[model samples]
Target: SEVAIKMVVVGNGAVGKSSMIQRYCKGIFTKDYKKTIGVDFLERQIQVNDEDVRLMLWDTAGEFDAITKAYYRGAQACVLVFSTTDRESFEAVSSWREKVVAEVGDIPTVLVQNKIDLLDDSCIKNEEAEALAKRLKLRFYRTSVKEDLNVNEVFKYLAEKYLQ
Candidate 1:
């Protein structure tokens, strides 16, 4: 049987949210930075535990607006991304969570600390990310979408959670 799940990717601009999706769905990571005007949609189908799962991926702009909140409607799961090297982005995770909660209520959510490749251990630490995730009750994922690290696992984990 095949099931379709809607997942939204939310984060600040330049946080690599789009790159993360492309790396997972297309297996190609680009260095170019293009701001998502509003929202972008991409889909990929994968087999999980012998079940066909179709992911409806919504890539949302990092800059929040009423339009962005509209995209949160009907989302079964969410991936909140932040750049490891950007403190402000990391700090905004809570605000993002609040926006999602206000728009969609509680849903399965994963916190992604992207651009781990650029980490010089000068920004948010693993412990801080983990602590935030714990407080928010979200699964934490550290990834280098540029290097394709943990990108698959993050999406897979969310898909599996949504499946259940």
Candidate 2:
């Protein structure tokens, strides 16, 4: 039998949520920005702990709070993302976490600091970011969907936790 996990990706607009999912699932990065309509998912298969696992990476749009509330119900885990260069996006991380937890109680969730390709422009530092992670009780990864940094490790962490 195969295992399937619903991994929801949520963040404010322009946090690279779509591109992150696109890069992970298709190995392609786009300079173009396409705002996701409301919700959609890209599927990826992986082998973890000798098990065939399917990860449904659900991408979401920012201004659909009401719609996303319902969209989050069946999620098995999540990726709460923010841009390293944007403090406002980072500020919303906890609210995003609460939204999903309010729906599913609590599952394996991760905090992704994205757009690290713009490391020089980053506004959030590791100390503050990791502190937020600790407070939120979520695992952390710094990634750049454009650069593909630690992206696989992000999903692999979630998949491995499910297997465990």
Candidate 3:
């Protein structure tokens, strides 16, 4: 059987959801903040259990969006993201998940603490994220579009879970 999955990536505006997706799909890191193009919509090919998977990803606005709500309808998985340097963003992870759950019910989801490259400015630490991830019952990852850390791994894990 062919596999196709829709995944929504949501977070506060400060979290770099757009950059993270761009880095993963295109393999380059840029800081330019565009609207939702890269993270707004994307399709990628992934292999899991030796089968080709058509993975579609969508990024949601931080304060939330009207058009964004419709995209969450068919998501098979979700990524909840926040910036380690921004405590406000980190704390909003749960609410983002709630919004997604409201739309698509509970699908596979993960917690992402981003901007590790700015550890110098990071207010959110690993242990805190670990605890939050556990509380949310989500797989956790720390990513830096600048350092190219754990970016692909996040999507890889999402794709793998679709077939499980």
Candidate 4:
């Protein structure tokens, strides 16, 4: 049987959740910000230790308070997203952490600080953001959906952690 890696992108709506996948999977980017009504999914294949692995990326709505708990159980990894420009989004990471812990029980998670190109000490700091990941014990990266910074690296990063 082939083992496929299931990666779920969990975060608040309009936090570049959809943009992240669209940019990586479709290689398309729109300047306009459209709300992700609910859930969106995309897939890409990667080579892990010379074995083909399928990466399932799930983009979930951050505003949707009523998330389906059942879906978390099947996830091999999670991308915890927060907008570095928005304090509220950064704060929301805690809720995501609690939900994943409660449902998935310490699954491999990558803490993503989106909109990092907009990084400003007054707005958000790298130390502050990395601290969150340290608290959760997850890998952390500062990503920019606009500049496509470190976006592709996310796939390879998670692949090494979960797939390989």
Candidate 5:
């Protein structure tokens, strides 16, 4: 049997939500950061442990609370993203998590710290990020869409969880 999962990617603007999805679904990377208006959809099908899975990836613009929440309603899972190099975006993860939980009632979710390729003195300490993941009880991945670090793993983990 085939399983279809709708996963919403929510985070602050320019946190690389679209980059992650574009890299995962199309194997391309864009250097320009374009603000995603409202919501955009992308689809990819992959075989997971002998089961065909279709992922409906939704990239949302978090600038408008109302529009973002409206898209969150039917999501089977969420990929909450934060920019590792930006402290404010990292701090906003909690709010994104809360909004998704409020709209979808605790569906399977993954926390992603993006742009690890630029990790330096400015980035959040990995220990702090991991601690928050553990505290929130959400699976976490440190990724760089440009480098393709754990991008596939993040989606695969969520897809398998949805299947189960």
Candidate 6:
């Protein structure tokens, strides 16, 4: 039987949530800054452990309080993204986590630190991020959406957990 998955990508504005989704779903990453007014959908079908899996990826707005509760409906899992270069965004993960849980229950969550290449001087410490992930009980991945690092693993783990 075919398994269908619906995952949501969320984070503060300009944190690369849409870019990550675009890269993972379409294999194309955009560098321009375009505000995702509200919720955006991207779909992709891939083979997972010999089974056909279809991903319905929702890119939701990360504005502090602009996102409507209606947008979180029907989410099976969530991707919490933070820019490795942005301090405030990184610090806002907990709030996002709480909001998602409040709105969607205890759904599976994946912590994604985008722009991983900036680790040299980036304010987002990997250790701190990992600790936060532990505190929040989410699967964590340090990724450079530009390099496609661990992006597959992100989806694979989610699939294995919820679909398999």
TM-score to native of every candidate shown? 0.90, 0.91, 0.90, 0.85, 0.91, 0.88
How many clashes in each candidate? 0, 0, 1, 2, 0, 0
CA RMSD per model (angstroms): 2.2, 1.9, 2.2, 2.6, 2.0, 2.4
What TM-score, to 2 decimals, does candidate 4 have?
Answer: 0.85
TM-score of candidate 2 on Cα atoms, chains taken together: 0.91
Q: Which runs in model 1 stand beyond 4 Å of their true positions?
A: 35-39, 62-66
Better of 3 and 5 by TM-score: 5
lDDT of 5 at 96: 82
The CA lDDT at 162 in model 6 is: 77
**TM-score preference between candidates 1 and 4, better one:** 1
Deviation from truth (RMSD, Å), model 3: 2.2
Q: So what's the TM-score on candidate 3?
A: 0.90
How many backbone clashes can be found in candidate 6? 0
**Range of the 10 consecutive residues with the lowest summed lDDT in candidate 5:** 31-40
Deviation of model 4 at 52, angstroms: 0.8
The digit string of per-residue lDDT tens for model 3 on 1-164 reads 66988888888775887777767767777656664573457778878889988878776554356576677767899888899788999887788888888888989888888888888988987788899999889999888877998988988898888778
Q: Deviation in angstroms for 33 in model 5?
A: 2.7
Query: lDDT by residue for model 1 over 89-159, one digit each (tens)?
Result: 99999999998888897888899999898878649978888899999988898899888899999989998
* Candidate 5 ranges beyond 4 A from true positions: 35-39, 63-66
lDDT of 5 by residue, 8-101 (tens): 9888878898888889988988677673424368889999889889898997754476675668758998899999778989888888888788
Give lDDT tens digits, candidate 4, residues 1-164: 35577778777766788888888777777888673424446887767778787887776653233466646658888788888767888888999888777777777778888888776643667788878789878788889988999898887788788754
